[PDB]
Amino acid sequence: MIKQRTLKNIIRATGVGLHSGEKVYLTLKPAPVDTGIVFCRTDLDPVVEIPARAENVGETTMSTTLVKGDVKVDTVEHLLSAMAGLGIDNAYVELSASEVPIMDGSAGPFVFLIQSAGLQEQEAAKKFIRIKREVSVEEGDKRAVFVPFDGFKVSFEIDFDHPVFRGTQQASVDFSTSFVKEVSRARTFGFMRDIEYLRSQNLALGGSVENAIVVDENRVLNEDGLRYEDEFVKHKILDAIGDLYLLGNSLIGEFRGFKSGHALNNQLLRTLIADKDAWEVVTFEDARTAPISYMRP
Ligand SMILES: C[C@@](C[C@H]1CN(c2ccc(C#CC3CC3)cc2)C(=O)O1)(C(=O)NO)S(C)(=O)=O
């Protein structure tokens, strides 16, 4: 059978929050079968625990924020993308502040630290959410769709309407391509034209060339440039993989994004969950006949 996965060893990292600029200590710990991914604010007494689930998303402005009363866990999408890409079902994520550290702006440091610690297969069938019917959400010129598909694939298209793109960005990934080699290293990005307005909203306080592609009209301010010709759209795919992981189980289906951000991604998840005719929970007693496969643990 395809088994549930957790961490083999604890992961420890220190960084800063992209939006808050606050120093944060992160600890990833193994968890029992069917725990899912749970964020723990260990700076609070008592510790506040928030399951990484669609129902717990409270804010979607320039990041995905989990909320429980007046307690927040901000910018979960990049770490969730790493956990999704590596097939981690169960884990406790301890944080000493309200925001996950931004690291280098990609999922690269998280995939490296997790793979260095190693994974542990658990004695329980991994549960998957299989798309049975097409589900689409739209708002103005933004669109996000789930389509039935025997595997897992993501398509993204965005007209950024910005001179750095030299006059529309698009990418498609079928994950059977490497999440690690082709998507994990894609960094988040910011535009100089938005920075004054963002800082006024208390956003991007920790933003810099050390943790994002910084654009100023025609220029990429980062001295060393881009990691991929299409780094921008590849990061949009990374974000979608992280946001989609708030379903609580890996998907068997196709996601198509059209200028879709954290807000529309969450609305798609909520619409899907409400439409029980469009999905079902499945397990694979035999990995040889399954439409997906994972890297060795
Ligand atoms: C929201 C987003 C972009 C991030 C990245 N970002 C950002 C903004 C400004 C700067 C900057 C700057 C210059 C002052 C140094 C860096 C990152 C921000 O506000 O949100 C993201 O990746 N979320 O997961 S995106 C790609 O726009 O969806």
Ligand SMILES: [Zn+2]
């Ligand atoms: Zn992002």
